[PDB]
Amino acid sequence: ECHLSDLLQQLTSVNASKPSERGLVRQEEAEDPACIPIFWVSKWVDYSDKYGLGYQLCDNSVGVLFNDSTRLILYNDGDSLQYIERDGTESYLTVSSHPNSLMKKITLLNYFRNYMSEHLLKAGANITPREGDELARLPYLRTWFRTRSAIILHLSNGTVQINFFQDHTKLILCPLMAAVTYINEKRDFQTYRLSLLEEYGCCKELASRLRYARTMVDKLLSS
Amino acid sequence: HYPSTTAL
């Protein structure tokens, strides 16, 4: 919605300053560890041929985006639940309760949760997330797509994550803090304010992906 | 099916 348009114009602004062509680029002066995101996808598995795409946030909370456009999130407490239908309504259940309507989707939310815990590696394991509100519900995965060069994930709180398969690098763009986190080939990370990148620019690695990440935002809003 | 980065 407005968040996707907000993100898009922030990317056009940094890409129009031509940040890599600077007499002296100082991306060392755009850091903001006070802008590290609260949640981000650190595990995911795509089984869309049968059920959908299951994931895990930085908290152990597990969510699944099913093929029928419904969603099921299991909080990192192991019990609390959240079900969101295609049309948007939310419902708050538990696993201690026995909602018969979903017992075939809870089993598959469990299968995804077991697989990710069994085989896949937690991305951003060396990052301290930033503290969130006390009684804040988790965000769900609104829309995702997966190409050959990268995968794109769009949470319900605006954050857009992009993992490049070849470089292993990862971007986490937040339109609210106006920041991006770049994860290095060596799993090193940093958070840069976006308006500061206009004034000081950045290296070729970060600059290149900010240009590519714009066309991906354009493909989320073309749909 | 396509999983993300395997523990390794």
Author numbering:
A (entry chain B): 371 to 593
B (entry chain D): 1 to 8
What did the article's authors report about this structure?
Polo-like kinase 1 (Plk1) is a well-known mitotic kinase and has been widely reported as a key player in cell division, centrosome maturation, and bipolar spindle formation during multiple stages of mitosis. Plk1 contains an N-terminal catalytic domain and a substrate-binding C-terminal Polo box domain (PBD). The PBD of Plk1 forms a complex through the conserved phospho-Ser/Thr (p-Ser/p-Thr)-binding module of its substrate. Human enhancer filamentation 1 (HEF1, also known as Cas-L or NEDD9) belongs to the Cas scaffold protein family (Efs/Sin and p130Cas/Bcar), which mediates signal transduction through protein-protein interactions.
Two phosphorylated peptides corresponding to 775KVMNSpSNQLC784 and 799LHYPSpTTALQE809 of HEF1, referred to as pSer-780 and pThr-804 peptides, respectively, were synthesized. Each peptide was complexed with Plk1 PBD, and crystallization attempts were made. However, only the Plk1 PBD complexed with pThr-804 peptide gave diffraction quality crystals. The final model included all Plk1 PBD (residues 371–593) and 800HYPSpTTAL807 of the pThr-804 peptide because the terminal residues were not clearly defined in the electron density maps. There were two copies of the complex in the asymmetric unit of the crystal, which were almost identical, with a root mean square deviation value of 0.36 Å for the 208 Cα atoms. The crystal structure determined at 2.9 Å resolution shows that the pThr-804 peptide is bound in a groove formed by Polo box 1 (PB1; consisting of residues 412–489) and Polo box 2 (PB2; consisting of residues 512–594) of Plk1 PBD. The core of the pThr-804 peptide adopts a β-structure, forming four hydrogen bonds with the last strand of the β-sheet in Polo box 1 of Plk1. In particular, Tyr-801 and Ser-803 of the pThr-804 peptide form hydrogen bonds with the backbone amides and carbonyls of Asp-416 and Trp-414 of Plk1, respectively. The phosphate moiety of the pThr-804 peptide binds to the positively charged binding pocket, forming hydrogen bonds with the side chains of Lys-540 and His-538 of Plk1, and stabilizes the backbone conformation of the peptide by forming hydrogen bonds with the backbone amide of Thr-804. The imidazole ring of His-800 of the pThr-804 peptide is located at the tyrosine cluster of Plk1 PBD and forms hydrogen bonds with Tyr-485, whereas Tyr-801 is on the hydrophobic binding surface formed by Trp-414 and Phe-535 of Plk1. Therefore, the structural analysis clearly suggests that the phosphothreonine at position 804 of HEF1 (pThr-804) plays an important role in specific interaction and recognition by Plk1 PBD.
